[PDB]
Design an enzyme around this catalytic site. Structure first.
Site, PDB file in Angstrom:
ATOM      1  N   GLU A  92      81.118  98.464  70.658  1.00  7.79           N
ATOM      2  CA  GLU A  92      81.070  99.848  71.020  1.00  7.79           C
ATOM      3  C   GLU A  92      80.669 100.143  72.445  1.00  7.79           C
ATOM      4  OE1 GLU A  92      78.749 101.985  68.062  1.00  7.79           O
ATOM      5  OE2 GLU A  92      80.372 101.937  66.622  1.00  7.79           O
ATOM      6  N   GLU A 119      84.533  99.210  62.080  1.00 10.23           N
ATOM      7  CA  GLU A 119      83.241  99.652  61.599  1.00 10.23           C
ATOM      8  C   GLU A 119      83.336 101.103  61.157  1.00 10.23           C
ATOM      9  OE1 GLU A 119      79.631  98.479  63.894  1.00 10.23           O
ATOM     10  OE2 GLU A 119      79.157 100.589  63.727  1.00 10.23           O
TER      11      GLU A 119
END
Length: 300
Positions: free
Chosen positions: A136, A225
């Protein structure tokens, strides 16, 4: 069974396909940070997920910061244990270089290159492995064009020198939500996917339209995710919105990994406090989130 049947995965016209060119959808679980909840990542728990939940992929979340690999690199051995279990269980496995507080993937790019060289040298001749090179990327100062794409263009060659075509998932800006910018300036490697992450506590109708915009540019998207909770990983369970996302991913052939396999006291955690780290969970040992995710994979 899964890996023997589908074998070598690749990207064809922006879709994940098996070695016979048929669309395939992976559905499974992500570990929580290996530096904290590594005891839940082992052959027995992964076999239980495979047999009782129906998983066909497992994601090893190797944080780099937060007491992870950079501070103590021994966690890389737990990644190796997960990959070896996936090979023994004939399921796919995602090796996740789990950046987060270290918000620009360039911060530890030299270490990332060395790590992915090692992992691809070890496992580059197995079809199970999927490399996720920057969980991320986040921050207003970290953009696709200036930071993420150039980082990918340094790390992908390292992997490709050892493993020419296993799938590589590349994170996107704003905590892997900004698939629109990535889709307008795609990487050259033909077996790349862009990560898209969501949390059901956030109203998601525009984010679904943004995933569709990216798919429309021919970009392949892997939901590496997602959680049933709010964006923090806690704050309530939002199963109505999670079901809308589950149906959306099925209609778009999107593969996914749910966050996460731990007993941590937060809504996104799949397990309750007394859940055995080696599997065999009763209904009462699953949280409301885990019960729902298990059902979704069993239904699939």
């Amino acid at each position: 069974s899964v890996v023997e049947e589908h074998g070598q995965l690749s990207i064809s016209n922006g879709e994940l396909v098996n070695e016979r060119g048929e669309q395939v959808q992976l559905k499974g679980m992500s570990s929580h940070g290996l530096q904290w909840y590594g005891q839940f990542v082992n052959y027995e728990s992964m076999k239980w997920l495979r047999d009782d939940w129906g998983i066909n992929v497992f994601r090893a979340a190797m944080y780099t910061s937060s007491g992870g690999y950079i501070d103590d690199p021994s966690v890389k051995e737990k990644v190796k244990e997960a990959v070896e279990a996936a090979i023994d269980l004939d399921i796919y496995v995602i090796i996740d270089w789990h950046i987060l507080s270290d918000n620009d993937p360039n911060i530890y790019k030299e270490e990332a290159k060395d790590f992915f060289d090692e992992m691809s040298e070890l496992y580059g001749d197995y079809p199970n492995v999927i490399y996720e090179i920057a969980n991320e990327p986040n921050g207003s100062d970290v953009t696709w064009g200036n930071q993420i794409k150039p980082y990918a263009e340094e790390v992908i060659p390292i992997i490709r020198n050892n493993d020419p075509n296993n799938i590589i998932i590349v994170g996107t800006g704003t905590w892997s939500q900004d698939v629109h910018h990535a889709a307008d300036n795609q990487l050259a490697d033909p077996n790349v996917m862009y990560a898209f992450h969501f949390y059901a506590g956030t109203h998601g109708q525009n984010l679904r339209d943004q995933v569709d915009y990216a798919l429309d540019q021919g970009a392949a998207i892997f939901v590496s995710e997602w959680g049933t909770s709010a964006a923090t990983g806690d704050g309530g369970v939002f199963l109505d919105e999670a079901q809308v996302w589950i149906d959306f991913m099925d209609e778009r052939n999107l593969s996914w990994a749910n966050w996460s396999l731990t007993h941590k006291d937060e809504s996104s955690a799949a397990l309750m406090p007394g859940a055995n780290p080696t599997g065999g969970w009763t209904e009462a040992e699953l949280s409301p989130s885990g019960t729902f995710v298990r059902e979704k994979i069993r239904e699939s």
